Amino acid sequence: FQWQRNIRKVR
Ligand SMILES: *C(=O)CCCCCCCCCCC
């Protein structure tokens, strides 16, 4: 909804 294709910010 807010983001694109990265939910968990680790990669
Ligand atoms: C917010 O924009 C992050 C991306 C979410 C995608 C969810 C799936 C959207 C399609 C739903 C169809 C019923």
What is the distance between the alpha carbons of residues 3 and 7, in angstroms, rounded to a whole number? 7
DSSP state of 2: -
Kindly state if the Cβ of 6 falls inside 6 Å of ligand 1.
no
Token reading at 10? 């680790």
Which ligand 1 atom is nearest residue 4's CA? 3
Q: Ligand 1 centroid vs 4 CA: distance in angstroms?
A: 9
Q: What type of residue sits at position 6?
A: N
How remote is the C-alpha of 10 from its chain's centroid?
A: 9
Kindly state if the Cβ of 5 falls inside 6 Å of ligand 1.
no
For residue 6, the number of C-alpha atoms closer than 13 Å in the C-beta half-sphere is 3
Q: What type of residue sits at position 3?
A: W
The experimental method behind these coordinates is NMR
Which ligand 1 atom is nearest residue 2's CA? 1
What is the distance between the alpha carbons of residues 7 and 9, in angstroms, rounded to a whole number? 6
Longest dimension (CA), the chain: 20
Helices (H), 1-11: none
Q: What type of residue sits at position 2?
A: Q
